[PDB]
Design a protein around this nucleic acid. Structure first.
Lengths: 147, 187, 124, 128, 52, 134
RNA sequence: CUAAAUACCGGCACGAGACCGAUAGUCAACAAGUACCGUAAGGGAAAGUUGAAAAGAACUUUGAAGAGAGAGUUCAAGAGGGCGUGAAACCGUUAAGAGGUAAACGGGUGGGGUCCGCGCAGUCCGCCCGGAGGAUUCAACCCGGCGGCGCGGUCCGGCCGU
RNA sequence: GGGACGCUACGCCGCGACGAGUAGGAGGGCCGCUGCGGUGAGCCUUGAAGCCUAGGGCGCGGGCCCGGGUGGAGCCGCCGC
């Protein structure tokens, strides 16, 4: 909508919203990110700290497929299986703990961020955290490694 | 000649919502009558919040509403939320509740009614409690947006922890001179 | 409902016309011919309408029933009054006040009928 | 013998002369329509004495007498016969005016319908 | 230029929302009158006709 | 609506075909309906006109019930010339007034070996709509 | 060695447009890469519209003729051959007004024109009274139809339940 | 225990205070142009657009509607784009 833009209200105004002393010239400060070690030093330090310099090790042929290790917290652990299995787990008097295969839903590591409900589980995952294991053992569950 | 400043003689606030939808406007029309005819300030907070923008009336998660009803106005007491009532997946047990909201997510309607709860709209709230009697008014985390992490004191400044504007985070993306004590300086 | 449909017809309606700093509506049952919530003939469940007679002598009074709300062929019933000036205004007053049929427009129908009878009066 | 309005208030106008453009008399390319000057050294822009007055909000007419004809009515553009029956409940306040492109045989359709409804016409005998 | 953004995409839920609003407003007698339709003689506005 | 994708609906293109049509196409555009007495006998709606056909004028300033024959067919002007359809020049000579073939009804045809062949052929497919259509 | 998915401002034939409308849109809507310019490489225009149909003004008269005056065609020559509509700058003529501080302008009046108000005897509308009139005429009953409401204190039966 | 108006609620009404402006910013335009989807049982050779106008007027204003002349074939109002 060009009718809703600013240029429709600027008709009849000489400087077109750009001033009379500092005319809207072509490139007063330089094109692009010019002047990092120069006249644009303060903006590059007060808003982008760490822009200039090298740090860390180079890695020539990096494949993002190798580093794929998605994580899941203990908050949304019971959301992986359906709600029907959660009701029957506490309802069952034999103590048959349902199995939640973390790799099946698309995660590899389990992190112990959240609280677990007091009913046993069997957790199959590719990796585990230290705190995630003690929370599972605290309820009376088992951590099963799988590859 | 009068030596007064017209710089801030015009208060900036919302008189009517910028939304053009007609269902909110009919609810706004209902609560304009309740504000100027009843003596309760509840009809003054609801009417003020009905004008507010989407970022001003943040969604309220279900687990927060359980948490604030674990410390309620001493138990039958309804919940009034101007925003949207969203569902939380890291909550196990939900009690029966009386919830008033402009919008409720579809999973949250099934979860509340499965526990024997009740969901009311704002026109039903006026028929139930015209003055807001026996009501708890709640709101979501206003600073819960990711936008506020970029706000405040600018980065590259001592004790000014604020997320910078970076296209992608990595080892060579604003970890150099402005951050390293080995390279130049740090704050 | 009445308030829900009013927010739609208030600006984007075919019967509404706006020119010369004025706003009018050409609805068949919009007596006083003004775009307003009270006077809209299509919006409300109960509607009073005053129109000139088909033969030019008398007035027809449009009465809207509450049974067939989505049945516009049956919802409207029309009665023709071809009596004297005093008796015509007495009947339209009786159909609105004594039936409690949308009573805020009783005098507006009286004003419209008093001019339609004057319009069909022989011109000097 | 014309159609009187309901009331005849005293029409007051703060200014009746048109607001002419600055230096509109000096040039033909400069039209009479008002344009607000925005020059740095413009005498009219900074309200010099003895210069062209600029339109302000203080020249607005009274809301009671705004858009009212000297006869006491307010105009309404009418294209066909069907638009006449709108004004029969606005008879003593608003008048009807026929459009320029209305044919002569359709103008002589309109006039008598407003005469039966006692609706005042600004231009009844236009073509004849 | 030819590469001006001519086309616009709408969410699937929003596309289905307006159709539901369009169908629901077609059953109210007052709204269809405002579209100028000359159907005052129609017996029932939700006009359902046999499959013949 | 037209449904053929290869048939032009453009106004500028259609006028280009009409004003730049070749001479054998010009004759086909110049077709005029037959008189009503011919129409049950030949079962033909309209037909291209030739040099010697009896013509009544239906529209224009020269319309009437007079019977006149064609003088010539001027395919370059979209104009035919009828016998007594003419106006007076200034110098005293007479000039034939041009009448478009659309405002022309034929009361008598010019029968020929090639003329007669079209009559059954136009009446053949005219009937075909009444066996296939019925 | 090897097709398919792929590209296509050249060419052939197409269809279409929320595009532009003769200073726009291709340079070129027209005898346009033409007229024209430069030794050459190359540069490169301007230019659409009578009328429905020429029915393109027969004939008379002045002038050497160009050009007119009559007459005629047309619905219209106020469409008369670069002719539809014909603005402004500019010029010619008619009417009015004015004129030694260049002209022009703002505010306030006054005078003169211009047409308009179709004003030239100044408002009608209701309620009551009077008397002159003229009706098929009022209230109240009977019959039929229609509509509204009902807390019928809760009549009966249908239909639905976000 | 038988009765005036009203209320396009984005509407109407009542109180007080104030009104400068360059660069610059914001809001309202029933200010204006062009084309598209709707809409006015819209206008129109008994005269469209365009143009001229010593007339009547409206709006603070951008501008707009009638009256007269010319013109001969299209044009506009409202809701959105």
């Amino acid at each position: 909508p060009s009718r809703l833009r600013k240029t429709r209200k600027l008709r009849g105004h000489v400087s077109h919203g750009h001033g009379r002393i500092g005319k809207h010239r072509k490139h007063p400060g330089g094109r692009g990110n010019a002047g990092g070690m120069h006249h644009h030093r303060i903006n590059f330090d007060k808003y982008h700290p760490g822009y200039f310099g090298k740090v860390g090790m180079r890695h020539y042929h990096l494949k993002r497929n190798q580093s794929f290790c998605p994580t899941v917290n203990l908050d949304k652990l019971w959301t992986l299986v359906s709600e029907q299995t959660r009701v029957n787990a506490a309802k069952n008097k034999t103590g048959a703990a349902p199995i939640i295969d973390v790799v099946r839903s698309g995660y590899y590591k389990v992190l112990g961020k959240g609280k677990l409900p007091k009913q046993p589980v069997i957790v199959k995952a590719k990796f585990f955290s230290r705190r995630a294991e003690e929370k599972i053992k605290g309820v009376g569950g088992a951590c099963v490694l799988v590859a | 000649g009068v030596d007064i400043r017209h710089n801030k003689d015009r208060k900036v606030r919302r008189k009517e919502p910028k939304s053009q939808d007609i269902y909110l406007r009919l609810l706004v029309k209902l609560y304009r009558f309740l504000a100027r005819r009843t003596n309760s300030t509840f009809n003054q907070v609801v009417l003020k919040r009905l004008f507010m923008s989407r970022t001003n009336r943040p969604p309220l998660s279900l687990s927060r509403m359980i948490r604030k009803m674990k410390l309620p106005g001493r138990e039958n007491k309804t919940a009034v939320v101007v925003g949207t009532v969203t569902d939380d997946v890291r909550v196990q047990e939900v009690p029966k509740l009386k919830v008033c909201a402009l919008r409720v997510t579809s999973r949250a309607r099934s979860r509340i009614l499965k526990a024997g709860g009740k969901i009311l709209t704002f026109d039903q709230l006026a028929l139930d409690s015209p003055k807001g009697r026996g009501t708890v008014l709640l709101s979501g985390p206003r600073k819960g947006r990711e936008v506020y992490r970029h706000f405040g004191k600018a980065p590259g400044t001592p004790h000014s922890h604020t997320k910078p504007y970076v296209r992608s985070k990595g080892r060579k993306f604003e970890r150099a001179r402005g951050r390293r004590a080995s390279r130049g300086y740090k704050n | 409902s009445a308030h829900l449909q009013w927010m739609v017809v208030r600006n984007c309606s075919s019967f509404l016309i706006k020119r010369n700093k004025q706003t009018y509506s050409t609805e068949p049952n919009n007596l006083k011919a003004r775009n307003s919530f009270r006077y809209n003939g299509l919006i409300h469940r109960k509607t009073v309408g005053v129109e000139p007679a088909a033969d030019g002598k008398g007035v027809v009074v449009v009465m809207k029933r509450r049974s067939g709300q989505r049945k516009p062929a049956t919802s409207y019933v029309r009665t023709t009054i071809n009596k004297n000036a005093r008796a015509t205004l007495s009947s339209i007053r009786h159909m609105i006040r004594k039936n409690k049929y949308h009573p805020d427009l009783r005098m507006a129908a009286i004003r419209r009928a008093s001019a339609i009878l004057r319009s069909q009066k022989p011109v000097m | 013998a014309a159609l009187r309005p309901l009331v005849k208030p005293k029409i007051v106008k703060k200014r009746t002369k048109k607001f002419i453009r600055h230096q509109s008399d000096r040039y033909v390319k400069i039209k009479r329509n008002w344009r607000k000057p925005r020059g740095i050294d413009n005498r009219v822009r900074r309200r010099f004495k003895g210069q062209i007055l600029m339109p302000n909000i203080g020249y607005g007419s009274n809301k009671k007498t705004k858009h009212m004809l000297p006869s006491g009515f307010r105009k309404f553009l009418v294209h066909n016969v069907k638009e006449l029956e709108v004004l029969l409940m606005c008879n003593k306040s608003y008048c009807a005016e026929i459009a320029h492109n209305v044919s002569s045989k359709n103008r002589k359709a309109i006039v008598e319908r407003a005469a039966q409804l006692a609706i005042r016409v600004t231009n009844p005998n236009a073509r004849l | 230029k030819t590469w001006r953004r001519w086309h616009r995409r709408v969410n699937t839920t929003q596309k289905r929302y307006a159709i539901c609003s369009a169908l629901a407003a077609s059953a109210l007698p007052a709204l269809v009158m405002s579209k100028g339709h000359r159907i005052e003689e129609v017996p029932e506005l939700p006009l359902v006709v046999e499959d013949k | 609506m037209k449904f053929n994708p290869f048939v032009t609906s453009d106004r500028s293109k259609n006028r280009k075909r009409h004003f730049n049509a070749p001479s054998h196409i010009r004759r086909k555009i110049m077709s005029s309906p037959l008189s009503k007495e011919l129409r049950q006998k030949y079962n033909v709606r309209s037909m291209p006109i030739r040099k010697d056909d009896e013509v009544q004028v239906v529209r224009g300033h020269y319309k009437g019930q007079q019977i006149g024959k064609v003088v010539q067919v001027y395919r370059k002007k979209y104009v035919i010339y009828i016998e007594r359809v003419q106006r007076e020049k200034a110098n005293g000579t007479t000039v034939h007034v041009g009448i478009h073939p659309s405002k022309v009804v034929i009361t008598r045809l010019k029968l020929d070996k090639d003329r007669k062949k079209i009559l059954e052929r136009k009446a053949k497919s005219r009937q075909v709509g009444k066996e296939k259509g019925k």
